[PDB]
Every structure is written in C-alpha cells, then in structure tokens.
Amino acid sequence: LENGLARTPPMGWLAWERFRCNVNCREDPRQCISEMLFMEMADRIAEDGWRELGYKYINIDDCWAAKQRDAEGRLVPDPERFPRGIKALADYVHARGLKLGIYGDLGRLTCGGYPGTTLDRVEQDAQTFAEWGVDMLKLDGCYSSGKEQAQGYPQMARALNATGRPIVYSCSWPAYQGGLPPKVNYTLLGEICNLWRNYDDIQDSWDSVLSIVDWFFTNQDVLQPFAGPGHWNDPDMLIIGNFGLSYEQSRSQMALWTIMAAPLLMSTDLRTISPSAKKILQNRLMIQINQDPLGIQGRRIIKEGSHIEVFLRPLSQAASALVFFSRRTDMPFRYTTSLAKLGFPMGAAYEVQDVYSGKIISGLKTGDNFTVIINPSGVVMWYLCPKA
Amino acid sequence: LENGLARTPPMGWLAWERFRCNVNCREDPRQCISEMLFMEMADRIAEDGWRELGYKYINIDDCWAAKQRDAEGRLVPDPERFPRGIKALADYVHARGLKLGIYGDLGRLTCGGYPGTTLDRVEQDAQTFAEWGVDMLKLDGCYSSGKEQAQGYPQMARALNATGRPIVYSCSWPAYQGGLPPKVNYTLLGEICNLWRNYDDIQDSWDSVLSIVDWFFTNQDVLQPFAGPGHWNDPDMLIIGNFGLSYEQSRSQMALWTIMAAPLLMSTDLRTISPSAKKILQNRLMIQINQDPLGIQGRRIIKEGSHIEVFLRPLSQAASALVFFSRRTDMPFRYTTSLAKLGFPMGAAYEVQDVYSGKIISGLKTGDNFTVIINPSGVVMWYLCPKA
Ligand SMILES: *[C@@H]1O[C@H](CO)[C@@H](O[C@@H]2O[C@H](CO)[C@@H](O)[C@H](O)[C@H]2NC(C)=O)[C@H](O)[C@H]1NC(C)=O
Numbered sequence: 001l002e003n004g005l006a007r008t009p010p011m012g013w014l015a016w017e018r019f020r021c022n023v024n025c026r027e028d029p030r031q032c033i034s035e036m037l038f039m040e041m042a043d044r045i046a047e048d049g050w051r052e053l054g055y056k057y058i059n060i061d062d063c064w065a066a067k068q069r070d071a072e073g074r075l076v077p078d079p080e081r082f083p084r085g086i087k088a089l090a091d092y093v094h095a096r097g098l099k100l101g102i103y104g105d106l107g108r109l110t111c112g113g114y115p116g117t118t119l120d121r122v123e124q125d126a127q128t129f130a131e132w133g134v135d136m137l138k139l140d141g142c143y144s145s146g147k148e149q150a151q152g153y154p155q156m157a158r159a160l161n162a163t164g165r166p167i168v169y170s171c172s173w174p175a176y177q178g179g180l181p182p183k184v185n186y187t188l189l190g191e192i193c194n195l196w197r198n199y200d201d202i203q204d205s206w207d208s209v210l211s212i213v214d215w216f217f218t219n220q221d222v223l224q225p226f227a228g229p230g231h232w233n234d235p236d237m238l239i240i241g242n243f244g245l246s247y248e249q250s251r252s253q254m255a256l257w258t259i260m261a262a263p264l265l266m267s268t269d270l271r272t273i274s275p276s277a278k279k280i281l282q283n284r285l286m287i288q289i290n291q292d293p294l295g296i297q298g299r300r301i302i303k304e305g306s307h308i309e310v311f312l313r314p315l316s317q318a319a320s321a322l323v324f325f326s327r328r329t330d331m332p333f334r335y336t337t338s339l340a341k342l343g344f345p346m347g348a349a350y351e352v353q354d355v356y357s358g359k360i361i362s363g364l365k366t367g368d369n370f371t372v373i374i375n376p377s378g379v380v381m382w383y384l385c386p387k388a
Numbered sequence: 389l390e391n392g393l394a395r396t397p398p399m400g401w402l403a404w405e406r407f408r409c410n411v412n413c414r415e416d417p418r419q420c421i422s423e424m425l426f427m428e429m430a431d432r433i434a435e436d437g438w439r440e441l442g443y444k445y446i447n448i449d450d451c452w453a454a455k456q457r458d459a460e461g462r463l464v465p466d467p468e469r470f471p472r473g474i475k476a477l478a479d480y481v482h483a484r485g486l487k488l489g490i491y492g493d494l495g496r497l498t499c500g501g502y503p504g505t506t507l508d509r510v511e512q513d514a515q516t517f518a519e520w521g522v523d524m525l526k527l528d529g530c531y532s533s534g535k536e537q538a539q540g541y542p543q544m545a546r547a548l549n550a551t552g553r554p555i556v557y558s559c560s561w562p563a564y565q566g567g568l569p570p571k572v573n574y575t576l577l578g579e580i581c582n583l584w585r586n587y588d589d590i591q592d593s594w595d596s597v598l599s600i601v602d603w604f605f606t607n608q609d610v611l612q613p614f615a616g617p618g619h620w621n622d623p624d625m626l627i628i629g630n631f632g633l634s635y636e637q638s639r640s641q642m643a644l645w646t647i648m649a650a651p652l653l654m655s656t657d658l659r660t661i662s663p664s665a666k667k668i669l670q671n672r673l674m675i676q677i678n679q680d681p682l683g684i685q686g687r688r689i690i691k692e693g694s695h696i697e698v699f700l701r702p703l704s705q706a707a708s709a710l711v712f713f714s715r716r717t718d719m720p721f722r723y724t725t726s727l728a729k730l731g732f733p734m735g736a737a738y739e740v741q742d743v744y745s746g747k748i749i750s751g752l753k754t755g756d757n758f759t760v761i762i763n764p765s766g767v768v769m770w771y772l773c774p775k776a
Pocket residue numbers: 002003004005160161162163164165166167
C-alpha cells in the first residue's frame with residue numbers, strides 16, 4: 001500500500017495473544033481489555049527503552065467496543081472499560097510520541113462477537129477511526145463471505161485514504177481464504193494493504209510457532225516475492241515473555257521473524273516482562289536486520305537430516321543474515337559448514353557478528369570451514385558484511 | 389526390592405539427558421562425560437543446598453567405560469576421561485556425604501556401543517561395582533532378548549545382594565518389553581528392583597514431557613498399584629533447567645513427577661542452573677510430598693473439556709496433594725470447583741497451602757466453591773490437611 005507508511009515492518013505492542021477477550025475488569029483490573037491496559041503499556045513503551053528502539057504502535061484488538069453501535073449507527077467503545085473514549089486514549093498515546101492502533105472486522109460480527117463492519121459501514125467506521133486519531137487498523141474477516149471480502153478490503157483501503165489521515169492498514173483477508181494462490185492474490189494485497197495475516201493465529205506454545213514457521217517456509221515460493229517496503233507478510237504476534245516458550249525458543253522466534261521481515265508486534269505484559277525476554281526483544285542489531293531498508297524477505301535454504309535448518313536473508317550494504325536453527329531435542333549440536341557450501345561468492349571474506357552473543361569473526365573466508373554450536377529448539381544468528 | 393533402600397523415591401543427579409554420550413573432552417571439557425563432570429556435580433550438590441534437601445545420588449550413565457573389558461574380562465572406565473578410576477570417584481563423592489551411581493546394560497552392548505553385561509558377566513560386574521564402592525546401578529536393556537532379560541534382571545538382583553553392599557537397583561526391563569501387562573509383570577519387578585523405567589526416554593521438549601505424562605496416566609490402572617516404598621515406577625529424568633521447557637512447564641513437570649511418586653533425578657548442569665529453575669527443584673514442601681512415607685502413587689482424577697486436568701495423591705497424616713494442570717494455549721484460566729465435587733469427605737474442612745506460592749487457606753469447607761487460576765502449560769498445586 002503506497003501511503004508512505006510501513007516502509008519497514010511495523011513495530012509495537014498488540015493486545016490479543018496475551019490478553020485475549022478478557023472483560024472481567026472487576027477481578028482482572030490489569031489484565032482486562034480496558035483503556036488502562038493501553039495507557040500503561042504506552043507508559044512502558046515510553047519509559048523502558050522500547051520507544052527508542054523503534055517500538056511505536058500500541059494496538060487494541062477485539063473486544064474493545066460496546067456490544068452495539070450507538071443510535072447514529074457509529075462504533076463506540078465499551079462505556080465501563082473505556083470511560084474517556086478512544087480519542088482521549090489516542091491523545092494520551094500521542095503525547096508519548098507513540099501511535100494507537102485499533103481493531104475492526106469486515107463482516108457481520110467480529111470473531112469475538114462485537115459489532116462488525118459491514119459493507120455499508122466501511123466509510124463511516126474509517127471516518128470514525130480517523131476522527132479519534134487512530135494510526136493503525138487491523139481488519140479481521142469473521143462473518144463475511146469471500147465475495148464480501150473481495151469488495152470490502154479494497155473498499156476500506158479507499159475509505160481510509162479519503163479521511164486524509166495516514167493509517168497503517170493490516171488485512172486478515174488472506175488467512176480467511178487459505179493464504180495461497182489462486183484463491184489469494186498477493187499482488188492485489190500489496191496494492192491495498194500495508195501488511196496481512198496469511199495464516200493461523202499464534203497460540204502460546206512452541207508447537208504453534210513451529211506450525212507457523214513450517215507453513216510460511218514450505219510455501220515461501222508464493223509468499224516471499226510479495227513482501228517489501230509498504231506491504232508485508234504477517235506471521236502474527238511475538239509471544240516472547242509469555243507462558244509457553246523456553247529461553248532458546250524465544251530467541252528462535254525473534255530470529256525467524258526477523259528472517260521473514262515480519263512485523264515485530266509484541267503481545268506480552270510489558271509490566272512484568274523478564275530481563276531475559278526484554279533483552280531478546282530489545283536486541284538492536286536484530287532490530288536493524290528486521291528493519292532493513294530493502295525489505296527483502298528471507299528464505300529457508302537448507303533442511304539437514306541432522307534436524308538443523310538454515311535460513312538466509314539478503315540485506316542492504318551488500319550484507320546478509322544467516323540463521324542456524326536446531327529442532328533436535330537431544331543436546332547442543334555442532335553444525336560444520338562453510339560460506340561457500342552455503343552458496344556465498346568464491347574467494348571472498350566477511351566480517352561476521354553473532355547477533356545474540358556479540359562475538360565477532362574478523363575475516364571469515366568463504367572457503368573456510370566453521371562450526372556453530374546450536375542448542376535444542378534454539379538458534380545461532382549471524383550478520384555478515386563483505387570485506388573489500 | 390527389599391534391600392532397605394529407596395524407601396522413598398531416589399533423589400539426585402543423573403548425567404544422561406543433558407550430557408548424553410559426549411566424549412569430546414578436548415572441546416567440551418565441562419560437558420563431556422569424564423570423572424571431572426561427576427566430581428563437580430558432587431561439589432554442586434554438596435555446596436548449593438541440594439544435599440540438605442535430600443538430593444544424594446550422583447549417577448553415571450552410558451559412555452563411561454573403555455570400549456572393551458580388560459584382559460581379565462573386567463569392566464574398566466575410559467583411561468583418558470576417568471584417569472583415577474571409579475573407586476577414587478566414589479570416595480570423592482562419599483567424602484561429601486553423597487552416593488555414586490553407575491550404568492550397565494544387560495546385553496551384548498550398551499545402547500551407546502560400550503561393553504555390555506552378558507549373562508556370564510553379571511556376577512563379575514556386580515562384584516566389580518561393589519568393590520569400587522558403587523551405591524546405585526541402572527541396568528539398561530539394549531541388545532538382549534526378552535528371554536535373556538527374564539533371566540538377567542532377576543540374576544543381577546541376586547548378584548548385587550551377594551556382594552553384601554546395599555545397592556539401589558534401577559531396571560529398564562519393562563521399557564524394552566512395552567511397559568504393559570501381560571508382557572510385563574510389575575509384581576515380579578517389585579520383588580527384584582527398587583525402581584524401573586517403564587517407558588520412552590525423555591527428550592528436551594514439552595511434547596516429550598506430555599507424551600510421558602499421557603502414557604503413564606492413561607495406563608495408571610496397571611501401573612499405580614505397583615509403586616511403593618522400595619519399588620517405584622520411573623517416568624525418567626527431570627529436565628528442569630535445560631533448553632526446552634518454559635518456566636510454567638518446568639513447574640508442571642516437578643508437580644506431576646511428585647504426583648507420580650517418581651524418582652527426582654535431575655539431569656541438568658548444576659553449575660549454570662538458573663535461580664528460577666533452582667527454586668523449583670529445591671521446593672521443600674514439593675520434596676516432602678514426593679518423599680511421602682506411604683509411597684502411594686497418585687492418579688489423574690479429572691480430564692475437563694476445558695483442557696484442564698486434575699490429579700490427586702493420597703498422603704501420610706491423612707493429607708492429600710492436588711494438581712490442577714492447564715493444557716490450554718490461550719491464557720490464564722479460572723477453574724472453579726469444590727473439594728466435594730472432587731470427591732472429598734462431606735462436611736469437612738481443610739487447611740490448604742499452595743505449594744509454589746506459599747499462600748494458605750485456613751479452613752476450606754468441602755462444600756465451598758473455590759477458583760484457581762492456572763497458566764498455559766502450567767499448574768496450581770495444593771497440599772491439604774484435614775482439620776478436626
Ligand atoms: C492516498 O493515496 C495517495 C496515492 O494514491 C497517497 O499519496 C502518496 O503518498 C506517498 C507517501 O506520502 C508518496 O510517495 C506518493 O507520491 C503519493 N502519491 C500521489 C499520487 O501523490 C496518499 O498518502 C494517500 N492518503 C492517505 C491518507 O493514505
């Protein structure tokens with residue numbers, strides 16, 4: 001989508017995976033979906049170093065609105081959970097130099113049972129969001145037919161533009177259509193959306209992450225070519241800092257999402273996040289690679305019988321990123337190979353930096369053998385710069 | 389096995405899951421299988437509070453011996469990796485008030501390819517171990533037929549007794565025979581072994597833990613009745629502190645192994661263990677319940693459609709232990725029920741202590757509703773004492 005936005009994958013926080021549709025603010029004041037949740041996450045992003053790293057979006061997902069539109073047919077937030085309205089929430093977020101994202105559903109109802117954005121409501125809702133000061137909109141696709149979606153998604157892109165307010169547009173259209181051609185036309189998506197959820201919702205477990213990793217890389221031929229500045233593939237939220245991932249697994253999701261040029265939308269409680277989880281999510285070099293200006297999504301290039309997978313992502317400044325991933329469940333594994341074997345130019349030399357450890361290799365020749373030790377369900381990630 | 393040993397499930401450290409058959413001491417001085425590994429783990433157990441809690445066994449697993457017996461036909465440790473011999477290692481461990489465990493295989497070769505204990509070598513090997521000062525022996529079953537195992541396992545029990553040295557005897561016999569009757573006779577196992585590996589080796593992943601949990605509880609009817617002081621079911625090593633389990637998952641394995649009256653044999657690097665992992669493994673109340681004098685293995689009593697499972701273990705002093713386990717992957721879950729609904733006596737009251745948080749409920753009436761909040765892949769564990 002050529003609206004000057006999302007020239008790099010969106011970075012921020014999104015409520016859904018961690019907080020879901022919790023409306024029990026009486027017993028879960030901090031974990032329930034309310035204006036307070038977003039204001040506090042905004043303070044967290046603004047105060048704990050996240051903002052400086054690039055994390056700027058504070059996104060509201062499903063279950064924020066009243067169970068019905070007002071009499072005028074407009075969407076309104078839940079009165080008890082959002083007593084100051086959305087515009088006020090936006091100002092608050094804006095005052096911190098952050099941006100506010102909201103959620104809607106092209107259809108009769110949101111997946112959670114809240115007011116849906118039917119075709120006759122698209123222009124009005126887009127208008128309502130802009131007036132509130134919204135900066136990003138995720139448009140879900142429950143309760144709408146393929147025909148209605150084919151009309152509605154492009155229609156909402158036009159409506160958003162008409163408001164004159166630049167709004168990042170996240171589309172779930174592909175996921176509802178199976179995520180693959182011919183049913184999905186990624187060329188069209190690139191023209192109308194800034195990013196799109198291609199596949200299943202991420203759940204809080206390592207198997208969920210693996211399921212997403214495997215679907216995207218198995219189908220990379222029909223997905224990788226359509227990602228770029230202004231239009232990204234979205235494998236869903238980062239679940240680092242939550243309940244299901246071990247330390248190694250958390251490092252793995254961050255690394256693989258970076259290879260995929262995926263949005264870095266955290267869905268975790270920033271008020272209780274652990275130091276190790278924070279350290280992973282705040283890795284500057286990792287973020288630099290994810291945010292690379294060229295926006296060329298990487299690919300899996302090797303699947304060893306040793307249960308080791310290798311990924312490569314081409315970058316700006318003639319650089320590259322490599323991820324060595326172990327799916328073994330026995331012990332740290334010694335993977336030995338050479339850049340030449342991985343496909344790099346002959347007779348060259350590279351300065352290599354281990355993204356997580358910081359260790360550097362001054363001048364690795366492409367013909368030289370090297371060994372990396374990868375832990376179970378973990379990765380070793382390299383940033384490579386050619387010497388001249 | 390009535391040898392006065394293992395009146396409570398064995399507690400200690402075992403090398404296998406974490407260190408496997410690593411013999412590359414040149415590049416992995418600390419992680420390779422050598423006398424140094426065991427001496428250092430012994431120091432760890434003796435110095436970091438483990439010994440006082442009950443952890444006393446330091447067990448050597450596969451890959452410790454020389455590739456062949458000496459000329460006299462006796463087992464000898466690998467010369468380079470165990471330069472001071474086993475007896476010296478035992479003395480060292482003994483000097484710390486700990487006990488040394490060793491590994492052998494009833495068959496032509498150990499699963500790792502090392503010298504096996506064939507039938508004609510049983511008496512000699514049992515003799516060799518006693519002389520070295522061995523306190524525990526795990527007898528694996530690779531490369532032996534069912535007929536040979538039927539003869540060898542009972543035969544080794546007799547050989548060990550004859551040495552006059554009390555030795556905990558861990559038998560893998562059942563695992564090689566499928567772990568279920570009629571092929572396996574757990575009454576016989578109780579007579580000849582102190583504990584036995586019934587099922588597959590644990591690997592470093594949550595799915596491995598779940599696979600073990602599900603097999604044992606699905607088949608609890610033919611397993612639970614045969615566990616007791618002196619003879620236990622062994623679901624394998626604790627992998628808390630390693631690469632594949634998240635925090636919640638680690639707490640879950642500890643709790644479920646305690647419900648199963650399982651040995652608490654840690655297989656992790658005690659030199660680098662995290663504070664949180666240490667805190668889980670050192671939980672005194674948890675250990676007290678695992679070590680309960682009655683030795684009555686618990687059972688799964690409920691499998692909700694909410695993906696919540698409930699476990700109960702009867703204890704001494706008319707007490708009980710309950711585990712509420714969530715296999716959901718969405719968010720913290722509120723499980724509401726009553727002790728009456730769980731099956732407890734009518735019109736009674738209990739003092740309840742949350743094993744992990746320490747929070748206490750003074751006098752919970754069996755008829756009163758209560759709610760516990762369980763995190764994804766996590767547990768809530770209670771210790772209950774009746775009031776009078
Ligand atoms: C509506 O669409 C127009 C283009 O159709 C957007 O204008 C483009 O903005 C980008 C970045 O600001 C420029 O690089 C292009 O040159 C512009 N194109 C044209 C035709 O001028 C405009 O930003 C959109 N409006 C909103 C609010 O999204």
